Amino acid sequence: CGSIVPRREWRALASECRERLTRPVRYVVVSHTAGSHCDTPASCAQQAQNVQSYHVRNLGWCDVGYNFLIGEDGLVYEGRGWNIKGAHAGPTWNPISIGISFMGNYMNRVPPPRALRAAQNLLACGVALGALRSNYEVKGHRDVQPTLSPGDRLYEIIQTWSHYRA
């Protein structure tokens, strides 16, 4: 189920991450990268590389912090994926959640409909696979940490999701 740009196709550095998540997962945390937006497969693969680069090389994480990334190209970029604990929401939320990040800054722009679809589609895929609970809950990054993430314009949107829980 789902179309996902695999690690190898956005030319990801090999993962060093080992800590597994306990399936099915109850919580999804939605962030923004607060970085550059991109609207083409070519530019969005490059941006996935840039986010992973910042996390592995500068913050010294085992991989890109996010389980999945969303491009404005309307594609899902594989991060740690469904089975591996992420680094996106702190030490209380990272063990019990999937972290999906919209590549961009959504303080003043909304992500386009294709990106919102790609994200909702991904989560349904999670349920279908048994990676997420049928009764999964969606959180803002700001609901679980002191942050503007995932941006006012995007936060306002995810609040209207059927699985949103403050």
**Contacts to Cl ion by CB under 5 A:** 61-62, 87
State which residue, 23 or 117, has the beta carbon closest to its own copies. Answer: 117
- Of 136, 110, 132, whose CA–CA distance to 22 is shortest? 132
How far apart are the C-alpha atoms of 148 and 47, rounded to whole Å? 21
5 binds its own copies (CB under 8 A): yes
Partner touching 87 among Cl ion, its own copies, none, CB below 5 to 8 Å by kind: Cl ion
Beta strand pairing call for 97-102 and 132-140: unpaired
- Give the interface segment with its own copies, choosing from 35-43, 82-90, 103-111, 155-163 (CB under 8 A): 35-43
Out of 46, 49, 83, 121, name the contact with its own copies by CB under 8 A.
Answer: 121
How far apart are the C-alpha atoms of 85 and 15, rounded to whole Å? 12
39 binds its own copies (CB under 8 A): yes
Beta strand pairing call for 25-32 and 132-140: parallel
5 in helix, strand or coil? strand
42 binds its own copies (CB under 8 A): yes
State which residue, 32 or 85, has the beta carbon closest to Cl ion. Answer: 85
Least distance between its own copies and beta carbon 8 (Å):
10
- Give the interface segment with its own copies, choosing from 17-25, 36-44, 85-93, 154-162 (CB under 8 A): 36-44
State which residue, 4 or 87, has the beta carbon closest to Cl ion. Answer: 87
| Matching residue, tokens 């919580």 | 27
Question: Which residues lie closer than 8 Å to 149 by C-beta, 6 or more apart?
Answer: 31, 32, 34, 140, 141, 142
